[PDB]
């Protein structure tokens, strides 16, 4: 029993984490086989930050302009190339600690673990979700760029996020490991702003199912709802629309608890209307939206 | 920017987790140098659990009754003995992945990372506080016994917790690595209950400082208080007493943010007496007490563990 925001064990990623220096800029890189992946903005200078021409900046660089340090070891850069917003540094050693891995681009609402890193060394691990506005609500200081987000299915690491930058509201933006940004963002210091964020409805429902599985029913009610009436109410509270896909996805949890998905939706409508009235659900006084249906089944 | 519940990187401990089987029971062990540590209740049947005599249960066992798997490699057990409530299985091979480590016993209020494991395989990592009532609010399913808790300071892993059981209210109980239970619990199937818990005051204050560092300032006010005065309020609200040692430990954050501990105590006093008035702090509608002052400083400064 119990229900906690759990991250994946970080060790398979820790063994991949290196330091990449270009000029006066140092940040983290991800070393898999003989390639080190890092944000291309490591080659930016102070005057380049608003409208850098990365192709022009990159063509001016030689392999020895990139220092890559793995623990106490310098790796030799023998090649370089850019893919979208990530730089790929060929090195002369395959990482002996390379796990089984893949690169996966995720959809808003998906969760993943973040290994926060500074100077190529891991600081801490925590759990995040891709917000509907394609930002994440991270914990990142200066020097954290190149830190990555991942899940681990069986023994295979699915890398899904690389950290690039912090927006003015203090949330974070970044790319998949093919260097494509999540959301409309660009690796330039020109004014950018996250869109208004919304609550991940399918995840809240998942987490309500988790509370039932761990023995709490106080918030249920005798009502149901049509899917359309639920969405009409929920969007007035800035919740994301719930789709038939999401309903389908909640099937297993509905069967395990015996509570129909649209019955749970009616419980959620009431909670939005009433609040908690001094009660809590799984230790929280707010509705939690950073647990997916998949997370709930794996943890419970 | 940002503030998250954050565990230590778990790789150094993942390399120490093994599978331990005795009879029909499988659970986790911790393999350090040439010893595998695990809960002594691994040797009990369900009937034994009602009133175990562990030394007597142990003498029937031979080394070859303890099946130990490290990955998909069997470890050879060449000796067994108990220390308090942990069983120590001496093996013929030192763990080549043994990190620099110590066994430490933590005090209530202190935090640590739990590496939840099943069948010797790490499955998740999360942050816990040792509660004032000596339980932890963990997330454990059947098979998780022998999972461990730890801190890292420099490159030394300080092991502080081994998971043993779940109490009827769904909270969890275990020992330090020398087999001594946290709290008034015993490893037997009998009536046991968590005592009434309290809130870790020094930790809530630390979290308020974290909020301020992150620009969350609405709860600050012009007032200050005294320790005796604030501690009467704390008692009234089932909060642990605040000592001068706590005040001194918060010193750094008081100088960094310009808010004295008794100044922030006056913020907390008002929060307890009036609530939050529909607002939140660092995304929470509850006062969070599972971050220590060290946790806040370390996360708001980027300390690392290569
Ligand atoms: C997010 C982003 C986009 C283009 S650059 C960048 C982050 N990098 C810097 O802001 C910087 C670079 C060089 C010297 C000082 C600061
Ligand atoms: Cl996805
Ligand atoms: Na490293
Ligand atoms: Na004040």
Coordinates of C-alpha atoms and ligand atoms in Angstrom, one line a residue:
Chain A
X1 CA 0.0 0.0 0.0
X2 CA 0.9 3.7 -0.2
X3 CA 1.1 5.9 -3.2
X4 CA 4.1 8.1 -4.0
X5 CA 5.5 10.1 -6.9
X6 CA 8.1 7.5 -7.9
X7 CA 10.9 7.9 -10.4
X8 CA 12.7 5.2 -12.2
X9 CA 16.0 4.1 -10.7
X10 CA 18.6 6.4 -12.3
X11 CA 21.7 4.2 -12.5
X12 CA 21.4 3.3 -16.2
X13 CA 21.3 7.0 -17.1
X14 CA 24.0 8.0 -14.5
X15 CA 26.5 5.9 -16.4
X16 CA 25.8 7.9 -19.5
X17 CA 26.2 11.4 -18.2
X18 CA 29.2 13.5 -19.3
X19 CA 30.4 17.1 -19.3
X20 CA 30.6 19.1 -22.6
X21 CA 32.6 22.3 -22.8
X22 CA 32.7 24.7 -25.7
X23 CA 34.4 28.0 -25.1
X24 CA 33.4 29.3 -21.7
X25 CA 30.1 27.3 -21.7
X26 CA 29.9 24.0 -19.9
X27 CA 26.8 21.8 -19.7
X28 CA 25.9 18.1 -19.7
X29 CA 25.9 15.5 -22.4
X30 CA 24.4 12.1 -22.9
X31 CA 27.0 9.4 -24.0
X32 CA 25.5 6.4 -25.7
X33 CA 27.7 4.0 -27.8
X34 CA 30.3 6.4 -29.5
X35 CA 28.1 9.5 -29.6
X36 CA 27.6 12.3 -27.1
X37 CA 24.3 14.2 -27.5
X38 CA 23.9 17.8 -26.1
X39 CA 22.0 21.0 -26.7
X40 CA 23.3 22.8 -29.8
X41 CA 23.2 26.1 -27.9
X42 CA 26.5 25.1 -26.2
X43 CA 28.2 26.7 -29.2
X44 CA 26.4 30.1 -28.7
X45 CA 28.4 33.1 -27.7
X46 CA 27.1 36.0 -25.6
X47 CA 26.3 38.1 -28.7
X48 CA 24.7 35.1 -30.5
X49 CA 21.9 34.5 -28.1
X50 CA 19.0 36.2 -29.8
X51 CA 19.4 35.1 -33.5
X52 CA 22.2 32.5 -33.6
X53 CA 22.9 30.9 -37.0
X54 CA 23.8 27.5 -35.8
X55 CA 25.0 26.2 -39.2
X56 CA 27.3 29.2 -39.4
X57 CA 28.5 28.9 -35.8
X58 CA 29.1 25.1 -36.2
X59 CA 31.1 25.2 -39.5
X60 CA 33.7 27.3 -37.7
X61 CA 34.3 24.6 -35.1
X62 CA 36.8 21.8 -35.1
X63 CA 36.6 18.6 -33.1
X64 CA 39.1 19.8 -30.6
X65 CA 37.0 22.8 -29.8
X66 CA 34.7 20.4 -27.9
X67 CA 36.0 19.1 -24.6
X68 CA 34.1 16.0 -23.4
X69 CA 34.9 14.7 -19.9
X70 CA 33.6 11.4 -18.6
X71 CA 34.4 11.3 -14.9
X72 CA 38.1 11.9 -14.8
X73 CA 38.7 11.0 -18.4
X74 CA 38.9 13.2 -21.5
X75 CA 37.2 11.6 -24.4
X76 CA 38.4 12.3 -27.9
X77 CA 36.0 14.0 -30.3
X78 CA 36.5 12.6 -33.8
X79 CA 33.4 14.1 -35.5
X80 CA 30.4 16.4 -35.1
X81 CA 27.1 17.1 -36.7
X82 CA 23.8 18.8 -35.8
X83 CA 20.4 17.2 -35.8
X84 CA 17.6 19.8 -35.4
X85 CA 18.4 21.4 -32.0
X86 CA 20.9 18.8 -30.6
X87 CA 24.6 18.4 -31.3
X88 CA 25.9 14.9 -31.9
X89 CA 29.6 14.6 -31.0
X90 CA 31.4 11.5 -32.3
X91 CA 33.9 10.2 -29.8
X92 CA 36.6 7.6 -30.0
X93 CA 35.3 5.3 -27.2
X94 CA 32.0 3.5 -27.0
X95 CA 30.5 4.0 -23.6
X96 CA 31.0 0.7 -21.8
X97 CA 28.0 1.4 -19.6
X98 CA 25.6 2.0 -22.5
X99 CA 22.2 0.5 -21.5
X100 CA 19.6 -1.0 -23.8
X101 CA 17.9 2.2 -25.1
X102 CA 15.6 3.9 -27.5
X103 CA 14.6 7.5 -28.3
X104 CA 10.9 8.2 -27.9
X105 CA 9.0 11.4 -28.5
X106 CA 6.2 11.7 -25.9
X107 CA 2.7 13.3 -25.9
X108 CA 1.4 15.8 -23.4
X109 CA 0.3 14.1 -20.2
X110 CA 3.1 11.5 -20.3
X111 CA 5.3 11.2 -17.3
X112 CA 9.0 10.6 -17.1
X113 CA 12.0 10.7 -14.6
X114 CA 14.5 13.5 -14.8
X115 CA 18.1 13.1 -13.8
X116 CA 19.2 16.6 -12.8
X117 CA 22.9 17.0 -13.6
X118 CA 25.6 19.7 -13.3
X119 CA 29.1 19.4 -14.8
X120 CA 28.4 15.9 -16.0
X121 CA 27.5 14.5 -12.6
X122 CA 24.0 13.6 -11.3
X123 CA 22.5 15.7 -8.5
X124 CA 19.0 14.2 -8.0
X125 CA 16.1 12.3 -9.6
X126 CA 12.5 13.4 -9.7
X127 CA 9.3 12.8 -11.6
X128 CA 7.8 15.2 -14.3
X129 CA 5.0 15.3 -16.8
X130 CA 4.8 16.9 -20.2
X131 CA 2.3 19.6 -19.6
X132 CA -0.5 20.2 -22.1
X133 CA 1.3 23.5 -23.0
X134 CA 4.5 21.4 -23.8
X135 CA 6.5 22.7 -20.9
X136 CA 7.6 20.7 -17.9
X137 CA 7.6 21.9 -14.3
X138 CA 11.1 21.0 -13.4
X139 CA 13.8 21.8 -10.9
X140 CA 16.7 23.1 -12.9
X141 CA 19.5 25.6 -12.1
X142 CA 22.1 27.2 -14.3
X143 CA 24.3 24.4 -15.7
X144 CA 21.5 21.9 -15.9
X145 CA 21.1 22.0 -19.7
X146 CA 21.6 18.6 -21.3
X147 CA 20.1 16.8 -18.3
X148 CA 17.6 14.2 -19.7
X149 CA 14.2 12.7 -19.0
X150 CA 13.6 8.9 -19.4
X151 CA 11.4 5.9 -18.6
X152 CA 12.6 2.4 -18.1
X153 CA 10.5 -0.4 -19.5
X154 CA 11.9 -3.7 -18.4
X155 CA 15.7 -3.1 -18.8
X156 CA 15.4 -0.6 -21.8
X157 CA 15.8 3.1 -21.3
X158 CA 13.5 5.2 -23.3
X159 CA 15.0 8.7 -23.5
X160 CA 12.3 11.3 -24.1
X161 CA 13.5 14.7 -23.0
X162 CA 16.7 16.8 -23.1
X163 CA 16.6 20.1 -21.1
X164 CA 17.4 23.3 -23.0
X165 CA 16.0 26.4 -21.3
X166 CA 13.8 28.0 -18.7
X167 CA 10.9 30.3 -19.7
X168 CA 10.0 33.5 -17.8
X169 CA 7.3 31.8 -15.7
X170 CA 10.0 29.5 -14.4
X171 CA 8.9 26.4 -16.3
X172 CA 11.1 24.5 -18.6
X173 CA 11.4 23.7 -22.3
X174 CA 13.5 21.2 -24.2
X175 CA 13.6 18.6 -27.0
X176 CA 13.3 15.0 -27.7
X177 CA 16.6 13.2 -28.4
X178 CA 16.2 13.8 -32.1
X179 CA 16.5 17.5 -31.2
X180 CA 12.9 18.5 -32.0
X181 CA 11.5 20.9 -29.4
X182 CA 8.4 20.0 -27.5
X183 CA 5.9 22.8 -28.2
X184 CA 6.3 26.0 -30.2
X185 CA 9.6 27.0 -28.6
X186 CA 13.0 27.8 -30.2
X187 CA 16.6 27.7 -28.9
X188 CA 16.9 31.6 -29.0
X189 CA 16.7 34.1 -26.2
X190 CA 14.0 36.0 -28.0
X191 CA 10.9 36.6 -25.9
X192 CA 8.9 33.4 -25.5
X193 CA 6.0 32.5 -23.3
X194 CA 4.3 29.3 -22.4
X195 CA 0.6 29.1 -23.3
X196 CA -1.9 29.0 -20.4
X197 CA -1.6 25.6 -18.9
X198 CA -4.4 23.1 -18.2
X199 CA -5.0 20.1 -15.9
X200 CA -4.4 16.6 -17.3
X201 CA -7.9 15.2 -16.9
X202 CA -7.1 11.6 -17.8
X203 CA -4.3 11.6 -15.2
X204 CA -6.5 13.0 -12.4
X205 CA -9.1 10.2 -13.1
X206 CA -6.2 7.7 -13.0
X207 CA -5.2 9.0 -9.6
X208 CA -8.7 8.9 -8.3
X209 CA -8.7 5.2 -9.3
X210 CA -5.5 4.9 -7.4
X211 CA -7.1 6.3 -4.2
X212 CA -9.9 3.7 -4.5
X213 CA -7.4 0.9 -5.0
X214 CA -5.7 2.0 -1.8
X215 CA -9.0 2.0 0.1
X216 CA -10.6 5.5 -0.1
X217 CA -14.1 6.0 -1.5
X218 CA -15.2 9.2 0.3
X219 CA -15.4 11.3 -2.9
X220 CA -17.5 8.9 -5.0
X221 CA -21.2 9.7 -5.6
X222 CA -24.3 8.0 -6.9
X223 CA -24.3 9.9 -10.2
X224 CA -23.0 9.4 -13.7
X225 CA -22.4 11.8 -16.6
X226 CA -22.3 11.8 -20.4
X227 CA -18.9 12.3 -21.8
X228 CA -20.0 15.6 -23.4
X229 CA -21.5 17.0 -20.2
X230 CA -18.4 16.1 -18.3
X231 CA -16.2 18.0 -20.9
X232 CA -18.5 21.0 -20.8
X233 CA -18.1 21.3 -17.0
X234 CA -14.5 20.3 -16.8
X235 CA -13.2 23.0 -19.3
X236 CA -14.8 25.7 -17.1
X237 CA -12.1 24.6 -14.5
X238 CA -9.3 24.7 -17.1
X239 CA -9.2 20.9 -17.5
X240 CA -8.1 19.3 -20.7
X241 CA -10.9 17.6 -22.7
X242 CA -11.4 13.9 -22.0
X243 CA -11.5 11.8 -25.2
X244 CA -12.9 8.4 -26.0
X245 CA -9.3 7.3 -26.2
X246 CA -8.8 8.4 -22.6
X247 CA -12.0 6.6 -21.6
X248 CA -10.8 3.4 -23.3
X249 CA -7.4 3.8 -21.6
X250 CA -9.1 3.9 -18.2
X251 CA -10.9 0.6 -18.9
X252 CA -8.6 -1.7 -16.9
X253 CA -8.7 0.5 -13.8
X254 CA -12.5 0.8 -14.1
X255 CA -12.7 -3.0 -14.1
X256 CA -10.3 -3.5 -11.2
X257 CA -12.3 -1.1 -9.0
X258 CA -15.8 -1.7 -10.3
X259 CA -16.4 2.0 -10.9
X260 CA -17.4 2.9 -14.5
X261 CA -15.2 5.5 -16.1
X262 CA -18.1 8.0 -16.5
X263 CA -19.1 7.4 -12.9
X264 CA -15.6 8.4 -11.9
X265 CA -16.1 11.5 -14.1
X266 CA -19.1 12.4 -12.1
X267 CA -17.1 12.1 -8.9
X268 CA -14.5 14.5 -10.5
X269 CA -17.2 17.0 -11.4
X270 CA -18.4 17.1 -7.8
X271 CA -14.9 17.5 -6.5
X272 CA -14.4 20.5 -8.7
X273 CA -17.7 21.9 -7.5
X274 CA -17.2 21.2 -3.8
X275 CA -13.5 21.0 -3.1
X276 CA -12.1 18.7 -0.4
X277 CA -13.8 20.3 2.6
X278 CA -10.8 19.7 4.7
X279 CA -10.2 16.1 3.6
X280 CA -7.3 14.7 1.5
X281 CA -6.9 12.2 -1.3
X282 CA -3.8 10.0 -1.1
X283 CA -2.2 12.7 1.2
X284 CA -2.9 15.7 -1.1
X285 CA -5.4 18.5 -0.7
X286 CA -5.3 19.2 -4.5
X287 CA -6.2 16.9 -7.4
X288 CA -3.0 15.4 -8.7
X289 CA -2.4 15.2 -12.5
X290 CA 1.1 13.8 -12.9
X291 CA 0.3 10.1 -12.6
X292 CA -0.7 8.4 -15.9
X293 CA -3.1 5.3 -16.1
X294 CA 0.1 3.3 -16.8
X295 CA 1.9 4.7 -13.7
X296 CA -1.1 3.8 -11.5
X297 CA -1.3 0.2 -12.6
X298 CA 2.5 -0.3 -12.3
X299 CA 2.6 1.2 -8.8
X300 CA -0.6 -0.3 -7.3
Chain B
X1 CA 14.0 27.7 -10.8
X2 CA 11.6 25.0 -9.6
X3 CA 11.3 22.8 -6.5
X4 CA 10.6 19.1 -6.6
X5 CA 10.7 16.3 -4.2
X6 CA 14.0 14.9 -5.3
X7 CA 15.8 11.6 -4.5
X8 CA 19.5 10.9 -4.6
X9 CA 20.8 9.3 -7.8
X10 CA 20.3 5.6 -7.0
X11 CA 22.9 3.9 -9.2
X12 CA 25.5 3.2 -6.4
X13 CA 22.8 1.3 -4.4
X14 CA 21.3 -0.4 -7.5
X15 CA 24.6 -2.2 -7.9
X16 CA 24.1 -3.7 -4.4
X17 CA 20.6 -5.2 -4.8
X18 CA 20.3 -9.0 -4.9
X19 CA 17.5 -11.6 -4.6
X20 CA 17.3 -13.7 -1.5
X21 CA 15.1 -16.8 -1.3
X22 CA 14.4 -19.1 1.7
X23 CA 11.9 -21.8 1.2
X24 CA 8.8 -20.3 -0.4
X25 CA 9.8 -16.7 0.5
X26 CA 11.6 -14.4 -1.9
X27 CA 12.7 -10.9 -0.9
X28 CA 15.5 -8.5 -1.4
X29 CA 19.0 -8.3 0.0
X30 CA 21.8 -5.7 0.2
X31 CA 25.2 -7.0 -1.0
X32 CA 28.2 -5.1 0.4
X33 CA 31.7 -6.5 0.5
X34 CA 31.2 -10.2 1.1
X35 CA 27.9 -10.0 3.1
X36 CA 24.2 -9.9 2.0
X37 CA 21.9 -8.2 4.5
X38 CA 18.2 -8.9 4.6
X39 CA 15.3 -9.1 7.1
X40 CA 15.5 -12.0 9.5
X41 CA 11.8 -12.8 8.9
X42 CA 12.8 -14.3 5.6
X43 CA 13.3 -17.6 7.5
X44 CA 9.7 -17.7 8.9
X45 CA 6.7 -19.6 7.6
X46 CA 3.3 -17.9 8.1
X47 CA 2.7 -19.8 11.3
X48 CA 6.3 -19.0 12.6
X49 CA 5.4 -15.3 12.1
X50 CA 2.7 -15.6 14.8
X51 CA 5.4 -16.1 17.5
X52 CA 8.9 -16.6 16.0
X53 CA 11.9 -17.9 17.8
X54 CA 14.4 -16.7 15.3
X55 CA 17.5 -18.4 16.7
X56 CA 15.7 -21.7 16.8
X57 CA 14.3 -21.2 13.3
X58 CA 17.9 -20.4 12.1
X59 CA 19.8 -23.4 13.4
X60 CA 17.8 -25.8 11.2
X61 CA 18.9 -23.8 8.1
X62 CA 22.1 -24.6 6.3
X63 CA 24.0 -22.1 4.0
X64 CA 22.5 -23.9 1.0
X65 CA 19.0 -23.1 2.2
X66 CA 19.7 -19.4 1.3
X67 CA 19.4 -19.0 -2.4
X68 CA 21.0 -15.6 -3.4
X69 CA 20.9 -14.3 -7.0
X70 CA 22.8 -11.2 -8.2
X71 CA 21.4 -10.5 -11.6
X72 CA 21.2 -14.0 -13.1
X73 CA 24.3 -15.2 -11.2
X74 CA 24.0 -17.3 -8.1
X75 CA 26.1 -16.2 -5.1
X76 CA 27.4 -18.9 -2.8
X77 CA 26.4 -18.5 0.9
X78 CA 29.2 -19.6 3.2
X79 CA 28.0 -18.4 6.5
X80 CA 24.8 -17.0 8.2
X81 CA 24.2 -15.1 11.4
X82 CA 21.8 -12.5 12.9
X83 CA 22.3 -9.1 14.2
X84 CA 19.1 -7.8 15.9
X85 CA 16.4 -8.1 13.2
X86 CA 18.7 -8.5 10.1
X87 CA 20.1 -11.7 8.8
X88 CA 23.7 -11.5 7.6
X89 CA 24.6 -14.0 4.8
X90 CA 28.4 -14.3 4.3
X91 CA 29.1 -15.1 0.6
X92 CA 32.2 -16.3 -1.2
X93 CA 32.6 -13.2 -3.4
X94 CA 33.0 -9.5 -2.5
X95 CA 30.5 -7.3 -4.4
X96 CA 32.8 -5.7 -7.0
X97 CA 30.3 -2.8 -7.1
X98 CA 30.5 -2.1 -3.4
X99 CA 30.4 1.8 -3.0
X100 CA 32.0 3.8 -0.3
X101 CA 29.4 3.3 2.5
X102 CA 28.6 3.5 6.2
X103 CA 25.6 2.3 8.2
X104 CA 23.9 5.2 9.9
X105 CA 20.8 5.5 12.1
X106 CA 18.7 8.6 11.3
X107 CA 16.5 10.7 13.6
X108 CA 12.8 11.5 13.0
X109 CA 12.4 14.4 10.7
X110 CA 15.4 13.4 8.6
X111 CA 14.8 12.4 5.0
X112 CA 16.2 9.7 2.8
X113 CA 15.8 8.0 -0.6
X114 CA 14.1 4.7 -0.8
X115 CA 15.0 2.3 -3.6
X116 CA 12.0 0.1 -3.9
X117 CA 12.9 -3.4 -5.2
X118 CA 11.2 -6.7 -6.1
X119 CA 13.0 -10.0 -6.8
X120 CA 16.3 -8.2 -6.4
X121 CA 15.4 -5.8 -9.2
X122 CA 15.2 -2.0 -8.5
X123 CA 11.8 -0.7 -9.6
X124 CA 11.5 2.9 -8.3
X125 CA 13.1 5.5 -6.2
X126 CA 11.4 8.1 -4.0
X127 CA 12.0 10.4 -1.1
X128 CA 10.7 9.7 2.4
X129 CA 10.9 11.3 5.8
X130 CA 11.3 9.3 9.0
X131 CA 8.0 10.4 10.7
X132 CA 7.9 11.6 14.4
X133 CA 6.0 8.3 15.1
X134 CA 8.9 6.4 13.5
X135 CA 7.0 5.1 10.5
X136 CA 7.5 6.1 6.9
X137 CA 4.8 7.0 4.3
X138 CA 6.2 4.6 1.7
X139 CA 4.9 2.8 -1.4
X140 CA 5.6 -0.9 -1.1
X141 CA 3.9 -4.0 -2.4
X142 CA 4.4 -7.7 -1.5
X143 CA 8.0 -8.6 -2.4
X144 CA 9.5 -5.3 -1.4
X145 CA 11.0 -6.4 1.9
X146 CA 14.7 -5.7 2.1
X147 CA 14.5 -2.6 -0.1
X148 CA 16.7 0.0 1.5
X149 CA 16.9 3.7 2.3
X150 CA 19.9 5.9 2.0
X151 CA 21.5 9.3 1.7
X152 CA 24.6 10.3 -0.2
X153 CA 27.1 12.8 1.2
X154 CA 30.1 13.3 -1.1
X155 CA 30.7 9.8 -2.7
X156 CA 29.8 7.9 0.5
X157 CA 26.4 6.2 0.6
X158 CA 24.9 6.3 4.1
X159 CA 22.5 3.4 4.4
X160 CA 19.8 4.2 7.0
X161 CA 16.7 2.0 6.4
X162 CA 15.8 -1.6 5.5
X163 CA 12.1 -2.3 4.8
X164 CA 10.4 -5.0 7.0
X165 CA 6.6 -4.6 7.2
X166 CA 3.4 -2.6 6.5
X167 CA 1.2 -1.5 9.3
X168 CA -2.7 -1.7 9.2
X169 CA -3.0 2.0 8.3
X170 CA -0.8 1.5 5.2
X171 CA 2.3 3.1 6.5
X172 CA 5.6 1.3 6.8
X173 CA 8.1 0.1 9.4
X174 CA 11.7 -1.1 9.2
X175 CA 15.2 -1.1 10.8
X176 CA 18.5 0.5 10.3
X177 CA 21.2 -1.7 8.7
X178 CA 22.2 -3.0 12.1
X179 CA 18.7 -4.5 12.5
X180 CA 17.3 -2.1 15.1
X181 CA 13.7 -1.1 14.4
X182 CA 12.7 2.5 14.0
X183 CA 9.9 2.8 16.5
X184 CA 8.1 0.5 18.9
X185 CA 7.5 -2.4 16.5
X186 CA 8.5 -6.0 16.3
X187 CA 8.9 -8.4 13.4
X188 CA 6.0 -10.6 14.2
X189 CA 2.4 -11.1 13.1
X190 CA 0.6 -9.5 16.0
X191 CA -1.5 -6.4 16.7
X192 CA 0.7 -3.4 16.0
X193 CA -0.4 0.2 15.2
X194 CA 1.3 3.5 14.3
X195 CA 1.1 6.1 17.1
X196 CA -0.5 9.5 16.4
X197 CA 1.8 11.4 14.1
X198 CA 2.9 15.0 14.2
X199 CA 4.2 17.5 11.7
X200 CA 7.9 18.2 11.3
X201 CA 8.1 22.0 12.1
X202 CA 11.7 22.6 11.1
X203 CA 11.0 21.0 7.8
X204 CA 7.9 23.1 7.1
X205 CA 9.9 26.2 7.8
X206 CA 12.7 25.0 5.4
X207 CA 10.0 24.4 2.7
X208 CA 8.6 27.9 3.3
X209 CA 12.1 29.2 2.7
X210 CA 12.3 27.2 -0.5
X211 CA 9.0 28.8 -1.5
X212 CA 10.4 32.3 -1.0
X213 CA 13.5 31.5 -3.0
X214 CA 11.2 30.4 -5.8
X215 CA 9.3 33.7 -5.7
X216 CA 6.3 32.4 -3.6
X217 CA 5.9 35.2 -1.0
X218 CA 2.3 35.9 -0.2
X219 CA 2.5 34.3 3.3
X220 CA 5.2 36.6 4.6
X221 CA 4.0 39.2 7.1
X222 CA 5.4 42.0 9.2
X223 CA 5.3 40.1 12.5
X224 CA 7.8 38.1 14.5
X225 CA 7.4 35.9 17.5
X226 CA 9.3 34.1 20.3
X227 CA 10.2 30.4 20.5
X228 CA 8.1 29.9 23.7
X229 CA 5.2 31.7 22.0
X230 CA 5.5 29.8 18.8
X231 CA 6.0 26.5 20.5
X232 CA 2.7 26.9 22.4
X233 CA 1.0 27.3 18.9
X234 CA 3.0 24.3 17.6
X235 CA 1.7 22.1 20.4
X236 CA -1.8 23.2 19.8
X237 CA -1.6 22.1 16.2
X238 CA 0.3 18.8 16.7
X239 CA 3.5 20.2 15.4
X240 CA 6.8 19.1 16.8
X241 CA 8.6 21.6 19.1
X242 CA 11.0 24.0 17.5
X243 CA 14.4 24.1 19.3
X244 CA 17.2 26.5 19.3
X245 CA 19.2 23.9 17.3
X246 CA 16.5 24.0 14.6
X247 CA 16.7 27.8 14.5
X248 CA 20.5 27.7 14.1
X249 CA 20.2 25.1 11.3
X250 CA 17.8 27.4 9.4
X251 CA 20.3 30.2 9.9
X252 CA 21.7 30.1 6.3
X253 CA 18.3 30.4 4.8
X254 CA 17.4 33.2 7.2
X255 CA 20.4 35.3 6.1
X256 CA 19.9 34.4 2.4
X257 CA 16.2 35.4 2.2
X258 CA 16.2 38.2 4.8
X259 CA 13.5 36.4 6.8
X260 CA 14.4 35.4 10.4
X261 CA 13.3 32.0 11.7
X262 CA 11.0 33.7 14.2
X263 CA 9.8 36.0 11.4
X264 CA 8.9 33.0 9.3
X265 CA 7.5 31.3 12.4
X266 CA 5.1 34.2 12.5
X267 CA 4.1 33.4 9.0
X268 CA 3.6 29.7 10.0
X269 CA 1.7 30.7 13.1
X270 CA -0.7 32.7 10.9
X271 CA -1.0 29.9 8.3
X272 CA -2.0 27.4 11.1
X273 CA -4.6 29.7 12.7
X274 CA -6.1 31.0 9.4
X275 CA -5.3 28.5 6.8
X276 CA -4.3 29.2 3.2
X277 CA -7.4 31.2 2.0
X278 CA -7.6 29.4 -1.3
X279 CA -3.9 30.0 -2.2
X280 CA -1.1 27.5 -2.6
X281 CA 2.6 27.4 -1.8
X282 CA 5.0 25.7 -4.3
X283 CA 1.9 24.1 -5.8
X284 CA 0.6 22.6 -2.6
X285 CA -2.5 23.3 -0.6
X286 CA -0.9 21.6 2.4
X287 CA 2.1 22.6 4.5
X288 CA 4.8 20.2 3.3
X289 CA 7.1 18.7 6.0
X290 CA 9.3 16.1 4.1
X291 CA 12.1 18.5 3.1
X292 CA 14.9 19.2 5.6
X293 CA 16.9 22.5 5.7
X294 CA 19.8 20.5 4.1
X295 CA 17.4 19.3 1.3
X296 CA 16.4 22.8 0.5
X297 CA 19.9 24.2 0.5
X298 CA 21.2 21.3 -1.6
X299 CA 18.4 21.5 -4.2
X300 CA 18.6 25.4 -4.4
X301 CA 22.4 25.1 -5.0
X302 CA 23.0 22.1 -7.3
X303 CA 25.2 19.8 -5.2
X304 CA 26.1 16.7 -7.2
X305 CA 27.3 13.1 -6.6
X306 CA 29.6 11.8 -9.4
Ligands
LIG1 C1 18.4 29.1 -24.3 C2 19.4 29.7 -25.3 C3 19.1 30.0 -26.6 C4 20.2 30.5 -27.3 S1 21.5 30.5 -26.2 C5 20.7 29.9 -24.8 C6 21.3 29.6 -23.4 N1 22.6 30.1 -23.4 C7 22.9 31.4 -23.0 O1 22.0 32.1 -22.7 C8 24.4 32.0 -23.0 C9 25.3 31.7 -24.0 C10 26.6 32.2 -24.0 C11 27.0 33.0 -23.0 C12 26.1 33.4 -22.0 C13 24.8 32.9 -22.0
LIG2 CL1 3.5 9.4 -25.0
LIG3 NA1 29.5 11.7 -15.4
LIG4 NA1 6.7 37.7 9.7

